[PDB]
Design a binder for this molecule. Structure first.
Ligand SMILES: Cc1cc2nc3c(=O)[nH]c(=O)nc-3n(C[C@H](O)[C@H](O)[C@H](O)COP(=O)(O)OP(=O)(O)OC[C@H]3O[C@@H](n4cnc5c(N)ncnc54)[C@H](O)[C@@H]3O)c2cc1C
Ligand SMILES: O=C(O)[C@@H]1CCCO1
Length: 459
């Protein structure tokens, strides 16, 4: 027997999308006036982003001719110019792969060593950005692997905490950790061994973060690990040494059917354990693998949505739920999507205060968007804080994170991919996801039908 809130998470695991999407719709819908201010802000943010160095206005203004025009413009004297016009198998494939990973991946890495990352934190921190550092590495395969991740996480907390120098959990830097790094073969670990071995290391790192008064966030990974992550979180929140401290962070993934039910659980947990939880709301990073995984499991359905617009709707519904309980949750709204950002900005209401919520972004992806957001109003900014997720490590820790980035940047449904498309008009790019879903429902006959190219695992 689970609590009321836990049982309800379980019962939502793979509920039919028509049902899941239908229940989210009214929770996600922006009231008329909020919708229009969100549309307008989303449009302005996306316009500035696209047309940074006049990229579209130069579209408005063949190549052969320009080279001749170029050569003609290098003729120093206009008269002369005018007068001229009048009158090896396995290891070769492995090497190209390892190299291309480094080349493409550098943009997403803040530094090789935590010091190096930290020494460069001054530039954006003075502009009002914050940081969450991640010592790259995950999915420990051996007892030794996990031990080494544990020591890298401990070392980072010391350096981050010393650099935080008492600025605290909101204004100061934090750390992000992956539970998969701390226990060998996490992907298949049983409740009993995780509690005996993983939990004491999570507890120990969290106590340390509390000594330095820095935030410590537990990243969300694959969906089959949600339940055990909640058991770990629960225990952690009742530690006496952590009483009255609100630095514990936890990620929730809006692409999951369970997400809203996990929120109901977290609200009850913050209440029972007498704390404000730092909760990062994301869409999620593992969608391609989740789809593949469920298709091989052959179960009743998917634990994630199959159309990107449904995830967008789920995120807005979940964002409203989070924003309603400021005594219990500090929401951290992770996104690079201008509509998403604008919707959250408006949904948060009037009378922003720094401790109400922040935005978050990944290093190498969100800086352009958030250069319009974080900063003074007199500089034309929104004056909302943003916390940059800063991966730290060498080439041997980068692979899995990089692949997730390529999937995110390379998917035609991604905002960061669609905004680069000269040809997709701004209004479509920032279209309201609820209205989009209702448009599909009127075309197709029912609300929340799965992606037509993604049938159920049994079909
Ligand atoms: C600071 C930060 C921290 C993050 N931490 C985590 C974390 O701990 N764990 C984690 O899993 N993710 C995490 N993410 C989220 C993930 O890494 C992506 O960055 C995020 O999902 C992209 O959302 P968006 O709003 O920027 O882009 P959008 O383009 O609006 O949405 C992109 C996405 O929608 C979802 N999607 C794509 N196609 C479909 C489809 N067909 N059906 C349903 N959904 C689809 C995927 O989640 C994909 O990322 C984090 C993101 C940030 C910025
Ligand atoms: O690892 C990832 O891909 C996501 C983004 C940062 C934390 O979890």
């Amino acid at each position: 027997p689970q609590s009321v809130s836990r049982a309800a998470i379980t019962a939502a695991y793979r509920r039919p999308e028509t049902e899941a999407v239908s229940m989210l719709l009214e929770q996600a819908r922006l009231p008329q006036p909020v919708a229009e201010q969100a549309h307008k802000l989303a449009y302005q943010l996306a316009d500035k982003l696209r047309n940074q160095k006049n990229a579209s206005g130069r579209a408005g203004m063949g190549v052969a001719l320009m080279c001749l025009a170029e050569a003609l413009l290098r003729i120093p004297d206009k008269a002369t110019r005018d007068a001229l016009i009048r009158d090896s198998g396995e290891p070769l494939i492995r090497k190209g792969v390892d190299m291309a990973m480094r080349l493409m991946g550098e943009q997403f890495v803040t530094g090789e060593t935590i010091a190096e990352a930290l020494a460069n934190a001054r530039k954006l921190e003075e502009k009002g950005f914050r940081y969450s550092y991640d010592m790259l590495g995950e999915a420990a395969l051996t007892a030794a692997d996990a031990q080494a991740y544990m020591v890298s996480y401990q070392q980072a907390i010391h350096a981050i905490g010393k650099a935080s120098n008492g600025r605290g959990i909101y204004e100061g830097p934090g750390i992000s950790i992956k539970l998969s790094a701390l226990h060998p073969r996490y992907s298949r670990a049983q409740y009993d061994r995780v509690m005996e071995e993983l939990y004491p290391r999570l507890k120990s790192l969290t106590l340390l973060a509390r000594q330095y008064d820095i935030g410590i966030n537990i990243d969300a990974e694959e969906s089959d690990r949600l339940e055990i992550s909640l058991d770990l979180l629960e225990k952690l929140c009742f530690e006496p040494e952590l009483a009255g401290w609100n630095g514990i962070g936890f990620v929730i993934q809006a692409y999951q059917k369970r997400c809203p039910l996990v929120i109901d659980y977290l609200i009850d947990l913050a209440t029972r354990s007498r704390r404000r939880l730092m909760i990062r709301l994301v869409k999620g990073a593992y969608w391609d693998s989740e789809i593949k995984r469920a298709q091989m499991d052959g179960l009743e359905g998917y634990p994630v949505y199959t159309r990107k617009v449904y995830t967008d709707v789920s995120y807005l519904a979940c964002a409203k739920k989070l924003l309603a309980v400021p005594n219990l949750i500090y929401p951290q709204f992770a996104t690079h999507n201008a509509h998403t950002l604008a919707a959250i900005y408006q949904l948060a209401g009037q009378n922003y205060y720094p401790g109400q919520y922040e935005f978050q972004c990944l290093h190498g992806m969100g800086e352009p968007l958030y250069e319009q957001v974080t900063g003074k109003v007199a500089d034309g900014k929104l004056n909302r804080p943003c916390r940059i997720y800063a991966p730290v490590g060498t080439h041997e820790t980068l692979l899995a994170y990089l692949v997730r980035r390529l999937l995110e940047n390379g998917a035609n449904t991604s905002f960061v991919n669609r905004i680069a498309d000269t040809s997709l008009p701004l209004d479509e790019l920032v279209a309201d996801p609820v209205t989009a879903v209702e448009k599909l429902a009127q075309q197709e006959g029912q609300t929340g039908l799965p992606h037509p190219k993604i049938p159920l695992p049994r079909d």
